[PDB]
Amino acid sequence: ASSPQRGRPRLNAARTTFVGDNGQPLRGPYTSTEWTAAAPYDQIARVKELGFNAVHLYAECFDPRYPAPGSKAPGYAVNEIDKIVERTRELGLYLVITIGNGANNGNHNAQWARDFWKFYAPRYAKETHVLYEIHNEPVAWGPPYSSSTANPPGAVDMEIDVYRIIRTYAPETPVLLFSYAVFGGKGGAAEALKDIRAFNKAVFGNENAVWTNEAVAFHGYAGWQETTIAVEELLKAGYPCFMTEYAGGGSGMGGLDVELTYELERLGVSWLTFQYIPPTGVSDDVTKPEYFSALVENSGLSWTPDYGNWPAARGVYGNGGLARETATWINNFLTGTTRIEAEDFDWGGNGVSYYDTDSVNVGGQYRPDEGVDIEKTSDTGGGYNVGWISEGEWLEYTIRVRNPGYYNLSLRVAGISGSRVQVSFGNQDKTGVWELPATGGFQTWTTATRQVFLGAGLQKLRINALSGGFNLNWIELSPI
């Protein structure tokens, strides 16, 4: 069809999340019409060149005082929300509409929420690119909302009541439930399942209903590790989910949480990050590199975007396509391999994941159709080495450092005089100029070692050749 409007998102076959009309996850930043005009078309359009296909809208913020005299009633921002709906329609973006909280996160006004959805559910029912998220962070700070000691109580009743209102007027619109601020651990999943069972009993007549057009909205404020565990457990229990707010700072500040993004990508979960579309928002501008694009580029995170060519296509070679996790010490032993073969640089291409001065692999070995020059090695263990290493060349390897601290970085090298490298981690220099040992021959091998101090997380290891005159067999990174 010729309309730019996206088709309704649907649950994927795996029932892990909502995917769009090309099968791909929804990925996006946010904006707000809670006390401002709709973000301009030209600014919303920028999301498409940042790898996104979706926008989170905090449409209006609730008034705890409603319906008392002077209180702000739902519907006040209709003219601006209509513009966001129109602009995303035209731009070929998905839109997740919710109720925001202002200074009152971890709280809600049930009557206000019911009245908001009575007004807006019918209004955007037929807008196929639009999803409804019942209410942002309605309880301080996570499950079980169904507990009598939840702060405030009764949010599951609001979820039920609002779901019925939505489905009355918008029978086919995806609904995102709960919007838990802090969703962590096996415990968090078990507590959420209490809420889910209560909801299901009330609206479907069965605690164990199989949702066809609903998912659990959750946030990342338990931290990436604990959130990943809770998500994994909920997916195992058969309930799809959708990340709707997170950042790498309980803080919405600090930019993209690269670690949690990586896990969500692995698990097949759509996500909305807490960085904003210009001109304004409460946290950090998603178009500022330091809060999003540079975090992606430094880490090696990649996904196939609906629009444009960013992030560039790339990934790990070998290791099941997973970032190469660094070993740790447990009970006086190393938990896994410390060695990365040099010929296992990330795929992506010349100028992307490596740079080689000859477009052809002049060695012909191992990866003949990429540009790094590779030969069979005569070193112990056999296999392959990178050879014909020229000044200015570089090789990247996406790794994941489990623990921050000191590591021994070793390079297995062979060569003549005057060889030097410099090694970056997440585009930060960790070695300075490193004068490598001469061995007297291109197949006479030695191990050069230098201590580095690393931060945790997904990060690219980049070897920059500051000279020629050496071959490289492998890299080791070993915790001290």
The footprint of Na ion (CB under 5 A) covers: 105, 341, 356, 358, 371, 373, 383-384, 435, 438, 473-474
Nearest approach, Cβ of residue 92 and Na ion (Å): 31
CB 460 within 8 Å of CB 397:
yes
Q: Is 142 annotated as a binding residue?
A: no
**Which residues neighbour 467 within 8 Å (Cβ) at sequence distance 6 or greater?**
391, 418, 419, 420, 421
Q: Is 360 annotated as a binding residue?
A: yes
Segment 348-354 long-range contacts (CB within 8 Å, at least 24 positions apart): 348/312, 348/313, 348/314, 348/315, 348/396, 349/314, 352/312, 352/313, 352/314, 353/314, 353/396, 354/393, 354/394, 354/395, 354/396
Return d(Cα 342, Cα 75) in angstroms, integer.
Answer: 60
Q: Is 104 annotated as a binding residue?
A: no
* CA-based nearest residue to 99, from 87, 91, 110: 110
Q: State the residue number with the nearest CB to Na ion.
A: 358
Tell me how many helices (H) and strands (E) the chain has. 8, 26
Size of the site for Ca ion (CB under 5 A): 3
Stretch that binds Ca ion, among 20-28, 43-51, 70-78, 380-388 (CB under 5 A): 380-388
Q: Is the dihedral of CA 28, 29, 34, 40 positive or negative?
A: negative
* CA-based nearest residue to 292, from 254, 266, 263: 254
Return d(Cα 176, Cα 159) in angstroms, integer.
Answer: 10
Nearest approach, Cβ of residue 360 and Na ion (Å): 5
CA distances from 82 to 39, 78, 173, 427 (A): 12, 6, 17, 42
Q: Does 246 bind Ca ion (CB under 5 A)?
A: no
Q: Does 52 bind Ca ion (CB under 5 A)?
A: no
**Which of residues 246 and 388 has its CB atom nearest to Ca ion in the complex?**
388
Nearest approach, Cβ of residue 370 and Ca ion (Å): 11
**What backbone torsions phi and psi does residue 423 show, to the nearest 5 degrees?**
-120, 125
> What does 473 bind: Ca ion, Na ion, none (CB cut-off 5 to 8 Å by kind)?
Na ion
Nearest approach, Cβ of residue 356 and Ca ion (Å): 4
What is the contact mask toward Ca ion in residues 340 to 359, using x (rule: CB under 5 A)? ----------------x---
Q: Is 346 annotated as a binding residue?
A: no
> What does 207 bind: Na ion, Ca ion, none (CB cut-off 5 to 8 Å by kind)?
none
Q: Does 137 bind Ca ion (CB under 5 A)?
A: no
Q: Is 290 annotated as a binding residue?
A: no
Binding site for alpha-L-arabinopyanose: which residues?
A: 34, 101-102, 105, 375, 388, 471
Binding site for Ca(2+): which residues?
A: 341, 343, 356, 358, 360, 371, 373, 384, 388, 393, 473
Binding site: which residues?
A: 34, 101-102, 105, 341, 343, 356, 358, 360, 371, 373, 375, 384, 388, 393, 471, 473
